[PDB]
Amino acid sequence: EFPRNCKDLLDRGYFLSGWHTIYLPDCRPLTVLCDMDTDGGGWTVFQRRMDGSVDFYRDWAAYKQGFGSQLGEFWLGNDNIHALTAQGSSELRVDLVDFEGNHQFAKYKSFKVADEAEKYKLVLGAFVGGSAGNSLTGHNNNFFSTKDQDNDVSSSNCAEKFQGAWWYADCHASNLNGLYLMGANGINWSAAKGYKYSYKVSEMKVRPA
Amino acid sequence: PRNCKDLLDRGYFLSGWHTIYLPDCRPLTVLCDMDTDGGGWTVFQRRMDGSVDFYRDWAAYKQGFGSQLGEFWLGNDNIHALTAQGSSELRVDLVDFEGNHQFAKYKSFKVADEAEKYKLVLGAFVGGSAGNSLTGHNNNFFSTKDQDNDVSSSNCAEKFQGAWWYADCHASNLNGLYLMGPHESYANGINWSAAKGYKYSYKVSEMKVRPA
Amino acid sequence: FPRNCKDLLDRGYFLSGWHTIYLPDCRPLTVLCDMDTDGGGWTVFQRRMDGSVDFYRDWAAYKQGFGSQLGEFWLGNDNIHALTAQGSSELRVDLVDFEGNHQFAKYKSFKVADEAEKYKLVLGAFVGGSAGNSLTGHNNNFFSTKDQDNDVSSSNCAEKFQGAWWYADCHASNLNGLYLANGINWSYSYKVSEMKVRPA
Ligand SMILES: [Ca+2]
Ligand SMILES: [Ca+2]
């Protein structure tokens, strides 16, 4: 019928991950990538990196709308992410695979992204656990920044300096939306300042708690 | 459409995911191979990079798991449903690490219902450059690490890390660990034996069926 | 209602992906929409990326289309003609070399005639692109396959360069040639190729 999230789809027999249309709070249809395999399944994937084929060094407008390909890398769009997390309580999961096939993850108790008027402010709950480490520690309430709209608290333009949009505060390292390095490689996710971690694949996803 | 063959006849010339309806009319999105050996094949297993964990339990293999964007096991209940009626042929398409396509084709293929433990009902091997690795596997029950149904004293699924229609296992199979060996051409990816004592490594595998 | 990827883009489909559009004869066709590159709304009719698909096929194969939505494909000459038979359409060729460098070639006008006209190439001016005009001087050329030689060269161009294309008097391989230099060639070897159209 009118699935409201990937969890509803999973309950309806959809055991394989894939794209499906779900209906947002205002019933706006949105085709999203459902992770039906990982940690119970029913996760709506809003970010995916895997080979650096997609340019993520985009402006505010692009991140607002979303960009990329369903066949590969993408950013679902901030308005969409806000819409997906505005209702109820949602948990955040970050799934990563290093360049040797090791899967690692990080999970957060609650995750919400405010609307554009609030600069897509990140409302992040407690770090639940995960082999990947808590790279988003202290990021609760950080506003979103893109190369053309610096809403971070650093003297440098974080989004430019780390070539990517994120919920920056006082930036010191690149993140999952940074440049996909080739020949550190891929993208970074580290909980320890001064130490980078290279991942080939990244997926940020949400599911009602 | 009740299968990919109906879709092919319907004009769907490109391989890809489409919805079909099992006998009970319950919809199921399946990967159709419309290119290989005349097209119309319904793919129930696909491996390509070892991104998906195939060391799963009976419940997992029963329902199916993985991703439409990559590796997956369509699900034994689904596979049974797809092969329960009439006669279906089985095709296994592999690609080694040097890009060479190899295959194995069987005259008839069917997976029994869960009641009969998804027993493999395999007809005659009709040829294929990949060799007949399923030789003498007909009537074998399906075994997963948690649901042991082979005719051995050991739990084959565990020893070779992977669910399969084991009898008395000897080597790994298409559902085993996707190895990352030091050598790319051999002892890498997944195994399918061309003949007895001669194992070969494959980077990609697809198991598919088509009504005969 | 959507007649092409531009219609889909305009209706909220911002991510590239496969969607159903309706051709002039109203028959549905699932096509790959590039919603990202150069304004988006491009209908991709050819894609190469790893050499997994055999492109050395006959007239019938190229006429209907072949390949996989999950990878490499040729949408089909009848479909390409159908997609460009009305109004004016732009052609874009997006390529990626073996190091990740994206390059492109863009043409102001592009159309593939019907089968009676041997899917003749109707190509407008080269609007630009980092990849250079490799289709230079191919306007009005017929499409040729290994079993249907419609070129002007004494030899069988499609066979000689193992791939179907709008050959004149062949001299090199093209985007529909053997995927090996590695990969495919465009007047330079590339790992990924996408040919796409959008109404102008
Ligand atoms: Ca700043
Ligand atoms: Ca046993």
Swiss-Prot record, chain C:
Residues where Ca(2+) binds: D149, D151, S153, S155
Region (P domain): 191-200
Subcellular location: Secreted; Cell membrane
Disulfide bonds, paired cysteine numbers: C5-C33, C157-C170
Residue ranges of every copy of the Fibrinogen C-terminal domain listed in the record: 2-200
Tissue spec: Peripheral blood leukocytes, monocytes and granulocytes. Also detected in spleen, lung, and thymus, may be due to the presence of tissue macrophages or trapped blood in these tissues. Not detected on lymphocytes.
Any one GO CC term of the record: extracellular space
A domain as annotated region, ranges: 2-41
Domain notes per entry: The fibrinogen C-terminal domain mediates calcium-dependent binding to carbohydrates and tethering to the cell surface in monocytes and granulocytes. The domain undergoes a conformational switch at pH under 6.2, and looses its carbohydrate-binding ability.
Protein name: Ficolin-1
Phylogenetic lineage: Eukaryota, Metazoa, Chordata, Craniata, Vertebrata
Boundaries of the shown chain within the full protein: 115 to 326 of 326
